[PDB]
Amino acid sequence: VFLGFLGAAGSTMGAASMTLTVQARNLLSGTVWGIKQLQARVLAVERYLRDQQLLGIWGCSGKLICCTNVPWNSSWSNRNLSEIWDNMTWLQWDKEISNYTQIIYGLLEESQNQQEKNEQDLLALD
Amino acid sequence: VFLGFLGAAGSTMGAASMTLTVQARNLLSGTVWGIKQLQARVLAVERYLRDQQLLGIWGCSGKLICCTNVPWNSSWSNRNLSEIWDNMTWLQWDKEISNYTQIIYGLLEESQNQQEKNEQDLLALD
Amino acid sequence: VFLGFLGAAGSTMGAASMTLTVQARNLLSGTVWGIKQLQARVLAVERYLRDQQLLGIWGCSGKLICCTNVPWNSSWSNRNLSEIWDNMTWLQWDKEISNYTQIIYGLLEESQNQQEKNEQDLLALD
Amino acid sequence: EVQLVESGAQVKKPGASVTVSCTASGYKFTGYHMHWVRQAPGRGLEWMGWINPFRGAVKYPQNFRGRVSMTRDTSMEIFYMELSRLTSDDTAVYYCAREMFDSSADWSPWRGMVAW
Amino acid sequence: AENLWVTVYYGVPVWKDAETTLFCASDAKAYETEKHNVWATHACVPTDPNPQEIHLENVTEEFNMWKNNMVEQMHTDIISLWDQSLKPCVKLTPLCVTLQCTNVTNNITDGELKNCSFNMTTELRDKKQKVYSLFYRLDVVQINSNKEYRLINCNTSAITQACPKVSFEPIPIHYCAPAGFAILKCKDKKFNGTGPCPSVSTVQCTHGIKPVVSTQLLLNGSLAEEEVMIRSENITNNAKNILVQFNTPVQINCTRPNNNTRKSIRIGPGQAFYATGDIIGDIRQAHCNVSKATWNETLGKVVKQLRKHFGNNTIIRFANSSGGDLEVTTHSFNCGGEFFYCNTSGLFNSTWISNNDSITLPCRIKQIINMWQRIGQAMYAPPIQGVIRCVSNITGLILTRDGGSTNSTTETFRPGGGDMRDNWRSELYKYKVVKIEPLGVAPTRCKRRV
Amino acid sequence: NPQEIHLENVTEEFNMWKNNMVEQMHTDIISLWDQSLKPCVKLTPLCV
Numbered sequence: 006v007f008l009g010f011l012g013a014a015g016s017t018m019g020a021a022s023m024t025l026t027v028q029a030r031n032l033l034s035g036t037v038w039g040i041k042q043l044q045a046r047v048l049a050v051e052r053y054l055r056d057q058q059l060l061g062i063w064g065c066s067g068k069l070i071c072c073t074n075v076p077w078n079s080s081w082s083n084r085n086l087s088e089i090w091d092n093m094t095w096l097q098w099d100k101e102i103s104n105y106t107q108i109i110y111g112l113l114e115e116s117q118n119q120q121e122k123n124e125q126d127l128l129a130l131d
Numbered sequence: 132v133f134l135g136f137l138g139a140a141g142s143t144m145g146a147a148s149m150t151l152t153v154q155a156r157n158l159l160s161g162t163v164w165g166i167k168q169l170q171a172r173v174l175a176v177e178r179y180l181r182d183q184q185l186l187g188i189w190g191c192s193g194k195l196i197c198c199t200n201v202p203w204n205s206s207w208s209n210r211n212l213s214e215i216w217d218n219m220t221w222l223q224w225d226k227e228i229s230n231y232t233q234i235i236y237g238l239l240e241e242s243q244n245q246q247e248k249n250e251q252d253l254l255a256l257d
Numbered sequence: 258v259f260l261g262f263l264g265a266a267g268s269t270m271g272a273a274s275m276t277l278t279v280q281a282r283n284l285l286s287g288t289v290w291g292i293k294q295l296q297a298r299v300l301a302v303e304r305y306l307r308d309q310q311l312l313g314i315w316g317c318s319g320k321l322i323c324c325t326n327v328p329w330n331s332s333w334s335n336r337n338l339s340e341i342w343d344n345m346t347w348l349q350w351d352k353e354i355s356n357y358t359q360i361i362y363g364l365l366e367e368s369q370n371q372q373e374k375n376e377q378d379l380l381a382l383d
Numbered sequence: 384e385v386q387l388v389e390s391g392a393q394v395k396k397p398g399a400s401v402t403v404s405c406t407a408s409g410y411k412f413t414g415y416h417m418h419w420v421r422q423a424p425g426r427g428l429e430w431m432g433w434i435n436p437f438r439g440a441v442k443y444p445q446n447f448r449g450r451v452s453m454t455r456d457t458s459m460e461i462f463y464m465e466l467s468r469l470t471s472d473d474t475a476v477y478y479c480a481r482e483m484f485d486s487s488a489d490w491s492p493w494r495g496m497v498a499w
Numbered sequence: 500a501e502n503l504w505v506t507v508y509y510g511v512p513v514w515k516d517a518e519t520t521l522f523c524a525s526d527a528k529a530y531e532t533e534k535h536n537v538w539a540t541h542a543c544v545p546t547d548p549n550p551q552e553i554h555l556e557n558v559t560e561e562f563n564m565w566k567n568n569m570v571e572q573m574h575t576d577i578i579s580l581w582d583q584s585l586k587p588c589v590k591l592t593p594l595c596v597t598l599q600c601t602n603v604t605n606n607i608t609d610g611e612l613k614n615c616s617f618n619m620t621t622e623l624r625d626k627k628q629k630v631y632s633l634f635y636r637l638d639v640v641q642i643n644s645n646k647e648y649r650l651i652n653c654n655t656s657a658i659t660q661a662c663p664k665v666s667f668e669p670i671p672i673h674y675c676a677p678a679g680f681a682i683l684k685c686k687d688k689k690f691n692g693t694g695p696c697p698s699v700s701t702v703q704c705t706h707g708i709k710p711v712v713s714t715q716l717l718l719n720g721s722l723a724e725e726e727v728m729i730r731s732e733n734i735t736n737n738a739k740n741i742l743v744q745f746n747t748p749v750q751i752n753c754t755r756p757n758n759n760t761r762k763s764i765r766i767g768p769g770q771a772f773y774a775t776g777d778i779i780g781d782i783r784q785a786h787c788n789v790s791k792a793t794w795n796e797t798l799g800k801v802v803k804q805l806r807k808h809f810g811n812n813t814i815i816r817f818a819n820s821s822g823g824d825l826e827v828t829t830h831s832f833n834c835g836g837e838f839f840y841c842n843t844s845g846l847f848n849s850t851w852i853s854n855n856d857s858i859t860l861p862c863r864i865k866q867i868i869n870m871w872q873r874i875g876q877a878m879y880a881p882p883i884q885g886v887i888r889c890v891s892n893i894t895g896l897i898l899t900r901d902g903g904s905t906n907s908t909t910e911t912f913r914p915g916g917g918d919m920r921d922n923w924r925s926e927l928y929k930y931k932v933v934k935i936e937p938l939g940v941a942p943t944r945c946k947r948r949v
Numbered sequence: 950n951p952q953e954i955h956l957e958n959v960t961e962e963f964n965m966w967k968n969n970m971v972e973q974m975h976t977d978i979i980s981l982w983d984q985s986l987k988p989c990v991k992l993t994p995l996c997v
């Protein structure tokens with residue numbers, strides 16, 4: 006099933022994981038008044054790459070999905086699994102967590118790949 | 132042996148796999164009439180990154196080579212392995228497959244990483 | 258401990274490996290005289306991506322740290338491990354190796370991923 | 384070619400003052416220092432000062448200071464120089480000369496005078 | 500194990516020196532100054548409410564102010580930014596007209612100022628306009644009955660009238676570095692701008708820097724720490740201008756003590772020339788005052804900093820400028836919109852051995868301006884209404900030495916300069932640009948898989 | 950094919966009176982107009 010770009014917006018978050026290949030696919034799209042379009046298409050890569058950085062500096066860089074050894078503080082919208090993916094869309098969901106997002110990432114970048122990848126060397130040096 | 136950039140063009144496709152580090156290496160290269168050069172070098176990254184996206188949304192992102200669990204429809208130039216790599220250059224080869232390329236990718240992006248990476252979570256959740 | 262951006266510059270190189278998540282994080286940062294800023298922010302991605310290429314064409318692409326099967330010629334500043342990481346900062350260190358850097362990379366791109374990734378297929382074809 | 388072309392020779396009474404014109408050509412006028420030098424008959428050379436043609440900065444020796452007035456007409460590309468209070472000792476053949484490189488260069492104006 | 504390999508490192512604290520295009524910043528409050536683009540700030544990016552600065556420990560970087568490209572990048576900016584402002588304004592090429600000038604109405608005791616009648620054009624292409632204006636003598640030159648005149652520029656350079664809406668007032672500008680580059684702030688107190696720096700910290704943006712355009716005297720600028728620092732690329736070379744930074748500011752009070760009428764003359768359609776009507780009342784000449792005390796106090800604080808470079812016991816003398824254009828021979832600055840030029844002979848008329856009132860400086864105002872000397876193009880600054888007054892912290896100096904003369908007896912010094920790059924160095928001495936090299940390769944006992 | 954994708958269970962808050970798209974366009978028509986005016990004939994000699 007292909008509902009098109011951003012079809013699963015009003016879908017519950019679980020139904021929206023089927024569409025990551027759709028939203029991520031068209032995220033890049035391959036004088037005077039010519040300026041108008043030019044500075045525009047630049048923001049697309051400035052925008053796209055800042056995630057690749059985040060995705061990259063974390064245990065991912067491998068797009069779509071990727072897990073992490075960072076736990077979940079219940080101080081960030083303590084909910085049941087079904088109460089989230091099954092009962093919430095992403096918009097409803099992303100609306101809540103936007104408080105601790107920056108607090109979340111400081112772990113994934115520093116607590117994880119800054120720390121976990123070095124342990125890999127400490128294990129791989131022998 | 133280093134034949135330079137694009138040396139293995141007229142080489143059979145198998146001989147050309149030796150040169151991926153050469154063609155991929157220089158693919159980026161680190162008022163009025165100044166405009167001329169400026170919009171040019173931008174297309175280089177717009178061009179380069181759209182592959183990183185394709186390479187990324189598929190099971191790759193790891194450059195040069197990478198395999199896939201997508202099969203091969205014989206409706207796409209049913210040939211023998213040797214009839215292709217050993218007897219064809221890439222130009223002769225790429226000339227044929229350009230029909231189903233878009234049909235091929237819709238699998239690698241959707242049938243694979245959209246589907247195979249989630250199974251990874253379903254296996255890694257326990 | 259978070260000493261900020263580039264805090265571990267005068268730190269010995271071993272102390273500076275704690276800060277890779279810091280220096281790599283802000284490496285991207287999300288008419289007339291408007292030109293001034295515009296061409297500037299473009300060089301940031303032109304600069305940033307040329308590493309992603311190098312990082313990518315080598316056995317890495319996975320940011321921060323990553324190992325390699327390329328040995329170490331003693332003709333490149335034959336030193337003891339402690340004489341480097343413990344007694345040298347990166348500036349003192351990077352000052353020396355800048356002679357054979359280009360000679361080093363020609364291995365990582367060609368001797369490694371150009372060669373080692375194909376062996377992977379030769380092993381994965383059965 | 385550049386060309387330093389000076390004024391005609393002059394025959395003057397003591398106690399007076401006298402200017403010399405020296406019109407430049409063939410290079411960026413305003414970018415190059417100009418020295419003035421007299422050479423008394425049979426004698427050595429007496430450096431009299433210099434001008435920078437950008438906004439007209441100058442610098443004279445202690446000997447020649449007070450008597451020397453050195454200028455340039457960026458519009459017309461003419462250097463002027465005036466020794467004043469002329470004495471019989473002030474009888475000489477007066478030159479203008481340009482240093483090797485433009486003012487942007489290091490150590491200009493003390494390198495060496497080329498066009499004469 | 501014991502043998503060494505190679506291992507890549509992304510994000511190592513490693514930088515190399517390089518130059519690149521920077522960009523500006525000038526707060527968000529100066530953005531509200533508007534008044535139809537005052538001076539510069541337009542697309543100028545706002546400032547970080549917390550200008551975060553990161554000290555760098557065991558970091559020793561070699562700074563140079565005299566070669567710092569940041570001075571040239573800025574220098575070319577002020578120039579080009581200025582022409583953009585000049586472009587939309589009124590071309591005064593119809594003013595290049597023979598002028599019937601009479602000296603100004605005073606009871607003898609002599610003019611500098613001319614009551615010049617002349618024919619002008621109107622918005623109607625055939626009808627013409629018998630008008631008169633006042634001009635300072637430096638703007639006109641007579642041309643050979645009463646004497647006729649003409650603007651001094653008319654024969655060399657075209658002339659345009661600065662838009663009356665734009666202001667020439669300086670605004671603090673923070674220069675900034677993009678991603679992959681950053682700025683280094685040399686923080687040690689006594690620092691001669693050349694050589695390495697003990698305390699090095701990084702900022703992404705310089706502080707607020709007001710592009711003050713002034714000759715001889717520096718105004719409204721940065722002060723030094725502890726002793727007054729004296730920096731010159733080379734002192735043995737007397738030709739190398741010497742830049743001074745104060746620890747203490749010197750107040751100066753400058754006025755145009757003349758209540759000024761401004762007539763707007765219609766040459767249009769859309770083209771309008773702002774002349775000068777009468778001065779209202781007493782005719783006084785512009786001047787600046789300086790506390791003769793604190794002035795002479797600062798002369799001594801300096802002269803004691805000089806013998807550090809010349810003799811334990813020696814003589815030091817001050818003289819006025821030897822010669823040059825008006826911009827160099829006198830003190831150029833824009834006060835209140837008018838452009839002032841003040842005789843500083845009374846400041847540099849002193850002599851110093853090993854061991855209450857205020858001065859006043861006669862000033863001159865010009866309106867036709869060719870600043871940066873670029874022939875072919877001159878700017879006519881319109882007049883400012885009423886009496887002008889402004890006050891500035893004197894914060895630095897540009898000086899030239901003398902020559903061989905007598906060997907070691909005594910040395911003389913005079914004002915000078917006139918290249919606005921040196922005005923920019925006064926603020927960028929502690930700044931320099933670098934590019935990062937985050938990829939690191941080093942040996943270790945690690946090895947990847949098979 | 951101006952492809953259009955309906956969004957289901959999607960409820961978005963629209964405003965026309967604050968929509969910046971109006972200002973971006975408004976400034977475009979103006980500036981586009983001066984570019985057209987620039988190469989043409991100045992009638993300042995007609996002020997007669």
Ligand SMILES: *[C@@H]1O[C@H](CO[C@@H]2O[C@@H](C)[C@@H](O)[C@@H](O)[C@@H]2O)[C@@H](O[C@@H]2O[C@H](CO)[C@@H](O[C@@H]3O[C@H](CO[C@H]4O[C@H](CO)[C@@H](O)[C@H](O)[C@@H]4O[C@@H]4O[C@H](CO)[C@@H](O[C@@H]5O[C@H](CO)[C@H](O)[C@H](O)[C@H]5O)[C@H](O)[C@H]4NC(C)=O)[C@@H](O)[C@H](O[C@H]4O[C@H](CO)[C@@H](O[C@@H]5O[C@H](CO)[C@@H](O[C@@H]6O[C@H](CO)[C@H](O)[C@H](O)[C@H]6O)[C@H](O)[C@H]5NC(C)=O)[C@H](O)[C@@H]4O[C@@H]4O[C@H](CO)[C@@H](O)[C@H](O)[C@H]4NC(C)=O)[C@@H]3O)[C@H](O)[C@H]2NC(C)=O)[C@H](O)[C@H]1NC(C)=O
Nearest residue numbers: 599600601604614615616617630631632760775776777778
């Ligand atoms: C530079 O600059 C300058 C400056 O200017 C200024 O400034 C500027 C900036 C601006 O602001 C301006 O505006 C100013 O002005 C310039 O110079 C100048 O100046 C001056 C100043 O003041 C000015 O003058 C003014 O003017 C005005 C006008 O007047 C006129 O007009 C009127 C009308 O409006 C009239 O009324 C009058 O009169 C006048 O004139 C006239 O005209 C007519 C016509 O044209 C004529 O007729 C004729 O005639 C003949 C025969 O004769 C024939 O016929 C012919 O055709 C005809 O046409 C007549 O004549 C005439 N008149 C005469 C007289 O003559 C007015 O407003 C004013 O005035 C007023 O005030 C005053 C007071 O303040 C008065 O009185 C006066 O006073 C005095 C003293 O104080 C006097 O003086 C004297 O004189 C004698 C002789 O005479 C001697 O010298 C002595 O020593 C002296 O001291 C005078 O004179 C008187 N005046 C007369 C006029 O008279 C007057 O008046 C008035 O008032 C009133 O009056 C009445 C009677 O009349 C009475 O009753 C009442 O009360 C009263 N009121 C009050 C409130 O006061 C005045 O004058 C002028 O304009 C000017 N100019 C110009 C051009 O602009 C210059 O220019 C420059 N430069 C260059 C180069 O750029």
Ligand SMILES: *[C@@H]1O[C@H](CO)[C@@H](O[C@@H]2O[C@H](CO)[C@@H](O[C@@H]3O[C@H](CO[C@H]4O[C@H](CO)[C@@H](O)[C@H](O[C@H]5O[C@H](CO)[C@@H](O)[C@H](O)[C@@H]5O)[C@@H]4O)[C@@H](O)[C@H](O[C@H]4O[C@H](CO)[C@@H](O)[C@H](O)[C@@H]4O[C@H]4O[C@H](CO)[C@@H](O)[C@H](O)[C@@H]4O)[C@@H]3O)[C@H](O)[C@H]2NC(C)=O)[C@H](O)[C@H]1NC(C)=O
Nearest residue numbers: 534666669718719832833834835836883888889890891892
């Ligand atoms: C070294 O630095 C010092 C300090 O930084 C500088 O000293 C400055 O000197 C300049 C002149 O060189 C002075 O500028 C003029 O000052 C006028 C006084 O304004 C104050 O009073 C009025 C009335 O009480 C208030 O409205 C003003 O408030 C404004 O500013 C504050 C911020 O301080 C804002 O919060 C407000 O919103 C206002 O914007 C001040 O308190 C002032 O009139 C004048 O500005 C007029 O003139 C210019 C052209 O000359 C016009 O572009 C502008 O629009 C203004 O025109 C209005 O006013 C005039 C009357 O003045 C009328 O004719 C017009 O119709 C119109 O209404 C100008 O700013 C300045 O005060 C002084 N101080 C500072 C802090 O800058 C030195 O110059 C400097 N040296 C060098 C070499 O740079």
Ligand SMILES: *[C@@H]1O[C@H](CO)[C@@H](O[C@@H]2O[C@H](CO)[C@@H](O[C@@H]3O[C@H](CO[C@H]4O[C@H](CO)[C@@H](O)[C@H](O)[C@@H]4O)[C@@H](O)[C@H](O[C@H]4O[C@H](CO)[C@@H](O)[C@H](O)[C@@H]4O)[C@@H]3O)[C@H](O)[C@H]2NC(C)=O)[C@H](O)[C@H]1NC(C)=O
Nearest residue numbers: 596597598599600615616617618619627628629630631644
């Ligand atoms: C703006 O521009 C105007 C026009 O250029 C200038 O005014 C003219 O100036 C000239 C020069 O003086 C005047 O010429 C003089 O004209 C007299 C004859 O004029 C008669 O006819 C005219 C019409 O053509 C009438 O308006 C006038 O009433 C007269 O009936 C002569 O008398 C003059 O020559 C004799 O006198 C002078 C001294 O005044 C002597 O030097 C001469 O040798 C000779 O003996 C003279 O030629 C002219 O009349 C003016 N007006 C016009 C053309 O209307 C303005 O000065 C100028 N203003 C500026 C530049 O500020």
Ligand SMILES: *[C@@H]1O[C@H](CO)[C@@H](O[C@@H]2O[C@H](CO)[C@@H](O[C@@H]3O[C@H](CO[C@H]4O[C@H](CO)[C@@H](O)[C@H](O)[C@@H]4O)[C@@H](O)[C@H](O[C@H]4O[C@H](CO)[C@@H](O)[C@H](O)[C@@H]4O)[C@@H]3O)[C@H](O)[C@H]2NC(C)=O)[C@H](O)[C@H]1NC(C)=O
Nearest residue numbers: 489490691693730731732733734735736737739807808809
């Ligand atoms: C302006 O900037 C210049 C440099 O840019 C500085 O000038 C230096 O000044 C000193 C003193 O005048 C000079 O040093 C002397 O030079 C002699 C030979 O010079 C040769 O060798 C040097 C290498 O040292 C080369 O750079 C140069 O090109 C020449 O080939 C040496 O013999 C001297 O050493 C001995 O003499 C002096 C006293 O004579 C003693 O103090 C020393 O201890 C020692 O016994 C001496 O080094 C130097 O050459 C100049 N450098 C250059 C490059 O020209 C100015 O100092 C600077 N001005 C200020 C105010 O800082």
Ligand SMILES: *[C@@H]1O[C@H](CO)[C@@H](O[C@@H]2O[C@H](CO)[C@@H](O[C@@H]3O[C@H](CO[C@H]4O[C@H](CO)[C@@H](O)[C@H](O)[C@@H]4O)[C@@H](O)[C@H](O[C@H]4O[C@H](CO)[C@@H](O)[C@H](O)[C@@H]4O)[C@@H]3O)[C@H](O)[C@H]2NC(C)=O)[C@H](O)[C@H]1NC(C)=O
Nearest residue numbers: 819825828829840841842843844845846848860861862863
């Ligand atoms: C920058 O600043 C300097 C210094 O302030 C100025 O230099 C001055 O220049 C003027 C102009 O020449 C000099 O003024 C001269 O002063 C004499 C004073 O007259 C009376 O005053 C004293 C006492 O008060 C009495 O002893 C004296 O007898 C008088 O009663 C006048 O004598 C001079 O004018 C007369 O002489 C000259 C010939 O020399 C004649 O041509 C004149 O017509 C007139 O008869 C004269 O005015 C002043 O002395 C200078 N001072 C200094 C220190 O140099 C610069 O001018 C100034 N520059 C700029 C660009 O602003």
Ligand SMILES: *[C@@H]1O[C@H](CO)[C@@H](O[C@@H]2O[C@H](CO)[C@@H](O)[C@H](O)[C@H]2NC(C)=O)[C@H](O)[C@H]1NC(C)=O
Nearest residue numbers: 008012013014015016017020094956957958959
């Ligand atoms: C929008 O929400 C509705 C209601 O939750 C979803 O419709 C349900 O779909 C499931 C699965 O097919 C059915 O079992 C329910 O009976 C449906 N209920 C109703 C009321 O429609 C619908 O699928 C959602 N669609 C999107 C795109 O979010």
Ligand SMILES: *[C@@H]1O[C@H](CO)[C@@H](O[C@@H]2O[C@H](CO)[C@@H](O)[C@H](O)[C@H]2NC(C)=O)[C@H](O)[C@H]1NC(C)=O
Nearest residue numbers: 134138139140141142143144146147217218220
């Ligand atoms: C171009 O094609 C020719 C012919 O197929 C190749 O030359 C052959 O190379 C092999 C391997 O060295 C030899 O065994 C054959 O004898 C050669 N034959 C001929 C006719 O040359 C050649 O290598 C190809 N080169 C490229 C760059 O494609």
Ligand SMILES: *[C@@H]1O[C@H](CO)[C@@H](O[C@@H]2O[C@H](CO)[C@@H](O)[C@H](O)[C@H]2NC(C)=O)[C@H](O)[C@H]1NC(C)=O
Nearest residue numbers: 260264265266267268269272346555556557558
């Ligand atoms: C700068 O160098 C100094 C000296 O090597 C470092 O200070 C040492 O730190 C260690 C670890 O805390 C102590 O055991 C030593 O006693 C310290 N010695 C001195 C002389 O300070 C310092 O940590 C370094 N800092 C950076 C940022 O490089």
Ligand SMILES: *[C@@H]1O[C@H](CO)[C@@H](O[C@@H]2O[C@H](CO)[C@@H](O)[C@H](O)[C@H]2NC(C)=O)[C@H](O)[C@H]1NC(C)=O
Nearest residue numbers: 689690691692693694695696730731732733734
């Ligand atoms: C400025 O001061 C610095 C030190 O702060 C001086 O740098 C010295 O320069 C010489 C070369 O002439 C080097 O060999 C020395 O090692 C430097 N000293 C230090 C402590 O770094 C520099 O000479 C001074 N320059 C001026 C013009 O005063």
Ligand SMILES: *[C@@H]1O[C@H](CO)[C@@H](O[C@@H]2O[C@H](CO)[C@@H](O)[C@H](O)[C@H]2NC(C)=O)[C@H](O)[C@H]1NC(C)=O
Nearest residue numbers: 750751752753787788789790791856857858890
């Ligand atoms: C320049 O003017 C300023 C203010 O216009 C003067 O400072 C004031 O001086 C008066 C006496 O004239 C004192 O009563 C005030 O307290 C001072 N105010 C400030 C804020 O300093 C200054 O003295 C003048 N300087 C000169 C050299 O005339």
Ligand SMILES: *[C@@H]1O[C@H](CO[C@@H]2O[C@@H](C)[C@@H](O)[C@@H](O)[C@@H]2O)[C@@H](O)[C@H](O)[C@H]1NC(C)=O
Nearest residue numbers: 076077078079080081082104105108109112
């Ligand atoms: C984990 O959460 C802790 C508790 O946060 C506090 O309590 C919750 C319920 C909210 O009210 C929140 O605003 C309070 O601050 C934090 O103290 C702790 O830092 C958190 N840890 C991380 C890594 O975020």
Ligand SMILES: *[C@@H]1O[C@H](CO[C@@H]2O[C@@H](C)[C@@H](O)[C@@H](O)[C@@H]2O)[C@@H](O)[C@H](O)[C@H]1NC(C)=O
Nearest residue numbers: 202203204205206207208230231234235238
């Ligand atoms: C696989 O191929 C099937 C057959 O394609 C049809 O037959 C071949 C020989 C060609 O003539 C071709 O044009 C015909 O459409 C397709 O029906 C089927 O969709 C293909 N599957 C995929 C995933 O591409």
Ligand SMILES: *[C@@H]1O[C@H](CO[C@@H]2O[C@@H](C)[C@@H](O)[C@@H](O)[C@@H]2O)[C@@H](O)[C@H](O)[C@H]1NC(C)=O
Nearest residue numbers: 328329330331332333334356357360361364
């Ligand atoms: C490894 O090093 C070999 C020796 O290099 C030579 O000797 C050293 C000590 C230096 O003086 C160096 O400049 C000399 O060239 C090289 O011959 C050999 O190519 C190197 N191998 C690689 C892969 O770099």
Ligand SMILES: *[C@@H]1O[C@H](CO)[C@@H](O)[C@H](O)[C@H]1NC(C)=O
Nearest residue numbers: 791792793795796797799800
């Ligand atoms: C100048 O300053 C000195 C201090 O160095 C002071 O003793 C002297 O009285 C001052 N002289 C004048 C004329 O202001």
